[PDB]
């Protein structure tokens, strides 16, 4: 939930002002699904979120 | 008459998104110049 | 000794503000340095 | 030096970064700070400076 | 509407250029703009190899050119010390400078002045696990 | 600009902290838009409101 919590946080960040620290987490956010979508699907079914 | 309405319309409004889209979308794209004209007269150092 | 220890610290200060070629002769306070930064005065005030 | 200079500053920059939460300013302000403390004998200056 | 500038293959697209399309003028432009490679030696600047030592001995002065930018290399053998002055900032063509350099050097008996610190304060050149780099390293790092 | 400047106001402290006094004005500035209603008022460029 903390990594939600901060996705939530950067989305929100993200509108109203559009700044650069923000869209810092979601770059990194959008670099961890880059990593994520290399190795078998079914692990992130299931398990911790 | 018209700010009796408006005050019965207002206390009861209930937040919509689309107003909310709308709202932001004006606040963040349309009024960008003036806004942007308000920070400039408002971060300037006046000496004497 | 007040006198030496005076001029030691004028040093040390001296060649650091060369390094950062920052022409500041005279050290300002925390306020001035946001008011120079484009800080509005009443939000100075209300901080205050 | 530390502990009081940065108490200080962490409270302005929080105060304004809530401030531009509040959004009156454009951009929030970050505030850094360091202390190098020169030794008598002039020896470790070269490795903080 | 030509190539646009990045270091890795900007001759590669002028090596295109030049073999499928046939024409070579961007290889020529590159030429001209960012390869000259050599090393010009200083006039004055004379070099005896003793064998004893199969090493150099004397003062050099060399010109690395490499198109619009130049490398400037001063050997003072009497205070056995080497001052290097260039302006190429792109990653595999300051590679080959340093890399020119260091050979220069080993001909001549000594090595690069190379320190680890934790960080630099002014402009100066550090070595990184992608390359070498022009400016402040603020990580603990290698700098020439 | 005034306007301009409640409205930004307005929305920037309903958001960071649903407050109720923004909402109030956020059902004014609705109501407004709704009154610009019931009539054409073709507003060209340069006139739009």
Redesign the interface.
């Given at each position: 939930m903390s990594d939600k919590n901060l996705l939530k946080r950067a989305l929100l960040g993200y509108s109203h002002k559009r700044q650069k620290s923000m869209l810092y987490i979601l770059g990194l956010f959008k670099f961890l699904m880059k990593l994520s979508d290399e190795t078998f699907q079914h692990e992130r079914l299931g398990q911790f979120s | 008459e018209v700010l009796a309405a408006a005050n019965s319309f207002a206390e009861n409004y209930s937040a919509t998104s689309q107003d909310m889209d709308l709202f932001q979308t004006l606040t963040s794209c349309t009024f960008s110049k003036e806004y942007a004209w308000k920070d400039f007269l408002?971060?300037?150092?006046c000496d004497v | 000794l007040d006198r030496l220890y005076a001029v030691r610290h004028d040093i040390?200060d001296q060649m650091?503000k060369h390094?950062w070629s920052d022409n500041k002769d005279s050290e300002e306070a925390?306020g001035k340095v946001?008011?120079?930064?484009?800080?509005?005065s009443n939000?100075i005030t209300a901080?205050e | 030096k530390k502990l009081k200079y940065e108490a200080?500053?962490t409270y302005?920059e929080q105060?304004?970064h809530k401030?531009f939460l509040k959004g009156?300013?454009p951009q929030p302000?970050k505030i850094t700070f360091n202390v190098?403390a020169?030794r008598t004998d002039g020896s470790n200056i070269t490795t903080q400076? | 509407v030509g190539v646009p500038p990045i270091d890795p293959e900007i001759q590669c697209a002028a090596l295109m250029i030049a073999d499928i399309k046939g024409d070579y003028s961007v290889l020529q432009l590159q030429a001209n703009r960012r390869a000259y490679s050599g090393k010009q030696y200083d006039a004055y600047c004379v070099q005896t190899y003793n064998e004893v030592t199969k090493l150099y001995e004397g003062d050099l002065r060399v010109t690395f050119n490499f198109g619009l930018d130049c490398a400037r290399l001063e050997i003072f053998w009497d205070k056995k010390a080497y001052i290097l002055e260039t302006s190429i900032t792109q990653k595999h063509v300051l590679k080959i400078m340093m890399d020119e350099v260091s050979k220069e050097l080993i001909k001549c008996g000594m090595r690069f002045n190379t320190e680890q610190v934790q960080g630099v304060?002014?402009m100066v050149l550090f070595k990184t696990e992608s390359g070498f780099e022009w400016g402040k390293p603020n990580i603990p790092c290698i700098v020439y």
């Open positions: - | 408002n971060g300037i150092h | 040390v650091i390094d925390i946001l008011l120079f930064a484009g800080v509005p939000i901080l | 200080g500053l302005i105060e304004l401030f009156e300013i302000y190098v020169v400076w | 304060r002014h």
